[PDB]
Amino acid sequence: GPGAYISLNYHSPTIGMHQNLTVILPEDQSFFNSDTTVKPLKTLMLLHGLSSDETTYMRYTSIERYANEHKLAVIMPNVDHSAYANMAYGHSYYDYILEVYDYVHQIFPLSKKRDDNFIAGHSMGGYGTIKFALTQGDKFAKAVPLSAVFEAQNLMDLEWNDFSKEAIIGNLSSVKGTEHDPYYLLDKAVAEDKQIPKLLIMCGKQDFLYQDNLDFIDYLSRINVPYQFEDGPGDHDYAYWDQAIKRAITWMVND
Amino acid sequence: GPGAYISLNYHSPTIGMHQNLTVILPEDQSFFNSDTTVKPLKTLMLLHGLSSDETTYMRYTSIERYANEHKLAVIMPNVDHSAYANMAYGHSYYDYILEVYDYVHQIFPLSKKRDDNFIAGHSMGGYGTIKFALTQGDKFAKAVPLSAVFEAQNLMDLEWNDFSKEAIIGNLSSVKGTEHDPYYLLDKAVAEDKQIPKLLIMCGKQDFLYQDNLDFIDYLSRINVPYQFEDGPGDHDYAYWDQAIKRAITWMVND
Amino acid sequence: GPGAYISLNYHSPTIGMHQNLTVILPEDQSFFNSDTTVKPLKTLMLLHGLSSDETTYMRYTSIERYANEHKLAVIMPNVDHSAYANMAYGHSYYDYILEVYDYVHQIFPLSKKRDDNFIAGHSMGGYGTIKFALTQGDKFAKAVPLSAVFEAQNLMDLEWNDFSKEAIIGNLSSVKGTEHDPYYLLDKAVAEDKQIPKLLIMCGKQDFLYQDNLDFIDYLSRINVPYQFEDGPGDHDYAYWDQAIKRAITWMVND
Amino acid sequence: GPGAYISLNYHSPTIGMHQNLTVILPEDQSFFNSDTTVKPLKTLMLLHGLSSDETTYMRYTSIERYANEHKLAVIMPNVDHSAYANMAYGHSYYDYILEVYDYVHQIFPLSKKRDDNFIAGHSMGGYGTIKFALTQGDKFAKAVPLSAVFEAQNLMDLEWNDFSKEAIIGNLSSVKGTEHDPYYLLDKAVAEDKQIPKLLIMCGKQDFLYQDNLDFIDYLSRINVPYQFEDGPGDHDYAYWDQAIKRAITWMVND
Ligand SMILES: *C(=O)N1CCCC[C@@H]1c1ccccc1
Ligand SMILES: *C(=O)N1CCCC[C@@H]1c1ccccc1
Ligand SMILES: *C(=O)N1CCCC[C@@H]1c1ccccc1
Ligand SMILES: *C(=O)N1CCCC[C@@H]1c1ccccc1
């Protein structure tokens, strides 16, 4: 089963600039028959890590092959070094992901039902995934952080090439207890009885963030929030993310 | 002002291969608001000439700027050296254009009303435009051949690099009186009382097809088919088609 | 080390039209220092199968990841339904591959040494690979047919979607003894003592072309031409070609 | 004149992320002769304005047609909302432009002589053009600011969609006397007997930056810096920049 690979570049009203976006749209027989109603596809929002962009999942994995097999549309935006935040000094990249979600669901044949919408991503994108899962729980039925950063201070303190902590968080001395802290977002969601998407958290056992993942699922267990955790051999690279996204895609479309 | 520039590559069931396609999709406020119904856009099917492809209108004109002013969606397929024919030895490129039409109208917010759908193209694409206008009149309200080939044997006998006459028409010596002949298609459309689209025919006065164009509008006049004809200085190049397509787009979107 | 992914569209003098080409160019520190001459890279010409195009290796495999690991440049042209032949009724796609080879070696930092240049491909592209291996042996030190068609009459008689046998071979009754026959090309290469590139032949055991590959390597054995043959589980799909190409790239650069 | 349109995406060591870049590469015979030495092309570094990106010159002008006509290679990078600065809280985008210059001169057949290299851009890109002209005068023989901002404080105090002045300049209350201020860069270039490329300054008379351009040219004569200023009807839009780059390209190439 094949599909369409789509590169879109549009002027975003939220971030004030042209920006590239890539979309995988699997083929359906209704797309070629003008007398049939388009039946909308299940949709995955997929978020890249630091130093990656909207092209890197396509280049370094076989994701389109996996998505085609499962009739899953995949949306891959670009957010730079933003950590998926409305940046103190930068762009409103949190709001941007929400605009991308609304835009593709308006212009493409994508289901708008919560049960048909998922979010996933790796490293900074796993951090982004858990932030959206805990603040936009009504938009996604399932969320898949891969090799995620859950202790936000480890992301902000990283000395990554050309990376600016202050652009994201400004003057802030710590992120604990703020909108940047997944532990705070999680306590907030439980306290307000928000829907939390079904969680499949994956991380390779040789990954440097492996302890970070253990600490977070340990906290989830202690506050009685369900999840699936899958580890096994793997490091912090696209060889691991290629295999994990294949497993994640199978899990999201099947129950 | 702003819009989306879209590159699509999908596996076409009609031509049995992956093929690239370009789409210009102007922005509409309904595209960014999940609570409003999408307002479908007026749509232009735009056909390239021989040796061009799906990228060349973008590269050699400012078509996206003009389309954006008038909120006109533009579909630009690729058909190789086919002359928009179901080839004797090749691909079913006539059927391909009908497939592209149904496909983009299924997956994008494009109006399906006849009054909102137009077709245009230059040289071999003007030849294609008049063929679809005279055989698919129920799909297009307006048609704009630019520097078109109306006497088909000029194209079939043209001595262009790597161009194969026989791939298109096979062993046929002449194209007159066949599906490849716009005069025949025209006589059959009038004889069968088919709806024929509103016609704007343009061609520069220094173009080698100028006299070819004069012959065709003279025949249109003798069989009581209306048209508007625009000439003036210009040759067979993108300096002319950049100008001509800007004027054509204003004519299409305005009653 | 991540490198560059490059999409090129240029007007080909050989096939008389614009055509898309994709290139993977791994990073070399000399690319960032204007005062040095570029260290020319090893280069692989990679040929797609029928119904694929210049984007399908990127989309359905992780080839860029594998190429980056081995600092291997990769050239991926598009040749439609041509079977890499100068078509009886169509385009001169055999000559086209030679033009692509000359073009990318002129404009990119690619080694022009025979020992640094390789060719590979699957199905129709493995058939193309073996023809180029046996007719351009001075240009390639290694050749890797994957799931190749070696008995050409099976591809010509294949009834694939919109596939035209006469477009390639015209009025020929059979392909035995012609330029289209790899067995003839092999006998001719041995008879004239042409250099034959180092051969790695791969085919999945569940592939319908498996017996066709066994027949060909048996003939190679009987005329004392060396080769390495790799089978194992796998069918005729990109799941198989994703890791045949990963093994092939390791084999090509490590001699 | 036909040519190559090239999209490149590479992981930049300077800005720590994958980034897209577009390149226009006109044809020369030597690109198709394996036996001739490639003749290096004249090269234009072309800088977009605020809210544009690496695709917008190709989409909203006919620049490739003009460049092909004069055998001019054109490099179009993306620098987001950076104003071509090494940002206080962001990316090292000044250094990035220098990396791009070195990179494309290593991997493409581009002349490294000063007399063959030019720089141009509009609005924020005209501001960028004058900054590189006055700090990298040895890399460029000619520079063309189009509708530029010379009084840098107009750009920093601008109230544009999602635009962050503090990302660029930090706490600075004024830009005067700093690297962001073109008037200081000009006095320092004159003071240090630094080479100033030949200057063609263009601005439409209805452009809101027109008085800002008049002020700069009045200062240029006042201190003996030669220039040509070209005005005429035009506003701050791509309709004007389409003229102006067409005229600008003819001026730089012909000598
Ligand atoms: C993930 O996107 N991050 C970017 C570089 C590699 C992993 C890294 C990270 C490491 C440690 C803490 C947070 C982020
Ligand atoms: C138009 O598509 N054609 C391609 C090459 C230039 C003009 C040419 C044509 C010339 C004369 C008759 C038919 C086509
Ligand atoms: C390979 O490119 N061919 C295209 C379709 C799938 C395999 C097919 C082929 C099958 C049998 C004989 C020849 C070709
Ligand atoms: C140019 O790129 N700038 C972005 C918005 C429109 C013009 C604008 C600018 C205006 C005035 C001063 C500096 C920049």
Automatic annotation (TrEMBL), chains A, B, C, D:
The keyword Hydrolase applies. InterPro entries: AB_hydrolase_fold, Esterase-like, S-formylglutathione_hydrol. Keywords: Hydrolase, Serine esterase. Pfam families: Esterase (PF00756). The active site is at S123, D207, H236. GO terms for cellular component: cytosol. This is S-formylglutathione hydrolase. It comes from Staphylococcus aureus.
